[PDB]
Write a protein that binds this ligand. Structure first.
Ligand SMILES: *[C@@H]1O[C@H](CO)[C@@H](O)[C@H](O)[C@H]1NC(C)=O
Ligand SMILES: *[C@@H]1O[C@H](CO)[C@@H](O)[C@H](O)[C@H]1NC(C)=O
Ligand SMILES: *[C@@H]1O[C@H](CO)[C@@H](O)[C@H](O)[C@H]1NC(C)=O
Ligand SMILES: *[C@@H]1O[C@H](CO)[C@@H](O)[C@H](O)[C@H]1NC(C)=O
Ligand SMILES: *[C@@H]1O[C@H](CO)[C@@H](O)[C@H](O)[C@H]1NC(C)=O
Ligand SMILES: *[C@@H]1O[C@H](CO)[C@@H](O)[C@H](O)[C@H]1NC(C)=O
Ligand SMILES: *[C@@H]1O[C@H](CO)[C@@H](O)[C@H](O)[C@H]1NC(C)=O
Ligand SMILES: *[C@@H]1O[C@H](CO)[C@@H](O)[C@H](O)[C@H]1NC(C)=O
Ligand SMILES: *[C@@H]1O[C@H](CO)[C@@H](O)[C@H](O)[C@H]1NC(C)=O
Ligand SMILES: *[C@@H]1O[C@H](CO)[C@@H](O)[C@H](O)[C@H]1NC(C)=O
Length: 342
């Protein structure tokens, strides 16, 4: 028997000690080895309540990723709280690895196995585990990359759909590849992401259908982010250590929901000067490495903000972008909660 509790988790990974890649290096020192024979017990006729929006596992993962980034991604110049910090900024090897989140003795993690669980409320099919699945700490905006997929239907998740200020996480049930490249050989910061338009528009159509179920069949309209920093108005992510900013206007194309089944090519740029997602200020990095810089990722989730004040109209307008990296972890941790064992 148990009760919802918070405690300090630890992490486990398969980091390689000989690797210089920074997530490996961090996990080699900050985490223990994974369990090759992990226990998972189904809790017979047990119903548990979960609330992904109030889940300290998220705050803890955020804490780790901040620490990882802080010790791994030194910029040449950091502008924070009005001070200027200068230091060496060598190119690094960067490629996220899965990190498992684990309970210490006297606690356990309950996992909701209801396939269509929306993240808050009762779960009928619950199991207990010592660690979460391995979650890659992929930092991005607008699109969630290399994550886990919903096992059945597309799921719409929100702390309160009625409140337009609350971010919506769209959990996809089918991956769509996004293939980003800064080609080897003009402009060294010019890059692009290629997406399969037929596949992407099919999924986006489905997301639209799902949104209708939640918004009384109102008309669903996508628009580009209203304004803000580039990290939010663009799909922002890190590829091989380089900070990419990609224009997603083409991805949220209302008319495709004409002959538009071809490759979607998003224009991207690599930026040396960025606003740190940690919310701490600005950083400047060295220019991109030479050669073909390339990441192919699965889009597995979408972060959306709904326009407020549209209650009198027959439309609901959505714009890509969540307002919080914690939501990235939320999207992976929603099915977990820590409890204390009696
Ligand atoms: C509950 O979830 C488990 C693990 O995901 C799955 O294998 C099983 O089919 C489900 N069990 C029940 C009682 O439906
Ligand atoms: C999720 O399901 C719960 C059932 O308890 C419901 O109360 C809540 O409104 C739902 N949220 C969404 C976004 O569907
Ligand atoms: C990408 O998604 C595919 C298909 O759903 C999956 O098989 C593969 O593991 C994913 N690759 C990742 C997570 O890097
Ligand atoms: C994904 O979910 C949608 C609607 O939520 C559904 O129509 C479709 O069957 C699902 N696709 C897969 C591959 O499970
Ligand atoms: C959900 O948001 C609506 C609109 O802001 C608000 O009126 C209502 O009180 C909220 N519900 C909860 C439980 O916060
Ligand atoms: C990614 O895009 C480039 C073309 O721009 C191509 O060289 C490469 O083969 C692509 N990779 C995949 C897996 O589609
Ligand atoms: C997208 O995938 C479909 C298969 O559903 C394929 O027919 C098409 O060649 C792909 N489109 C592009 C241009 O990548
Ligand atoms: C994205 O691209 C569109 C069309 O090319 C452009 O008008 C828009 O301003 C771009 N968005 C950003 C934030 O650069
Ligand atoms: C939507 O797609 C069509 C392609 O047929 C194109 O005319 C239009 O420019 C697109 N809107 C975008 C990409 O913003
Ligand atoms: C997604 O995972 C693939 C396979 O490990 C990797 O090549 C790609 O760069 C990852 N994307 C991001 C943004 O980390």
């Amino acid at each position: 028997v148990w009760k919802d509790a918070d405690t300090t988790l630890f992490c486990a990974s398969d980091a390689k000690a000989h690797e210089t890649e920074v997530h490996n290096v961090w996990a080699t020192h900050a985490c223990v080895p994974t369990d090759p024979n992990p226990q998972e017990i189904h809790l017979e006729n047990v119903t548990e309540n979960f609330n992904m929006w109030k889940n300290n596992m998220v705050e803890q993962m955020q804490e780790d990723v901040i620490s990882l980034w802080d010790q791994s991604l030194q910029p040449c110049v950091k502008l924070t709280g009005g001070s200027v910090i200068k230091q060496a900024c060598p190119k690094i090897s960067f490629d996220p690895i899965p990190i498992h989140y684990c309970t210490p003795a006297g606690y356990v993690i309950l996992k909701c196995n209801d396939k269509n669980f929306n993240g808050t409320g009762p779960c009928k099919n619950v199991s207990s585990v010592q660690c979460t699945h391995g979650i890659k700490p992929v930092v991005s905006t607008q699109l969630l990359l290399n994550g886990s997929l919903a096992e059945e239907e597309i799921i719409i998740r929100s702390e309160n759909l009625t409140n337009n200020a609350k971010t919506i996480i769209v959990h996809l049930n089918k991956s769509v590849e996004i293939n980003c490249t800064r080609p080897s050989n003009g402009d060294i910061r010019k890059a692009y992401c290629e997406i399969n338009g037929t596949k992407w528009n099919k999924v986006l159509k489905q997301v639209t259908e799902k949104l209708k179920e939640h918004f009384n069949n109102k008309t669903i309209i996508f628009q580009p982010p209203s304004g803000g920093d580039l990290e939010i108005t663009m799909h922002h992510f890190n590829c091989r250590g380089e900070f990419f900013y990609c224009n997603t206007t083409q991805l949220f194309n209302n008319t495709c929901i004409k002959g538009c089944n071809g490759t979607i090519t998003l224009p991207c740029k690599i930026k040396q000067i960025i606003n740190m997602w940690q919310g701490t200020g600005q950083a400047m990095y060295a220019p991109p490495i030479d050669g073909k810089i390339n990441c192919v990722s699965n889009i597995t989730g979408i972060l959306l903000t709904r326009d407020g004040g549209a209650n009198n109209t027959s439309n609901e307008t959505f714009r890509p972008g969540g307002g919080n990296i914690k939501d990235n972890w939320r999207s992976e941790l929603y099915k977990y909660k820590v409890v204390q064992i009696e």
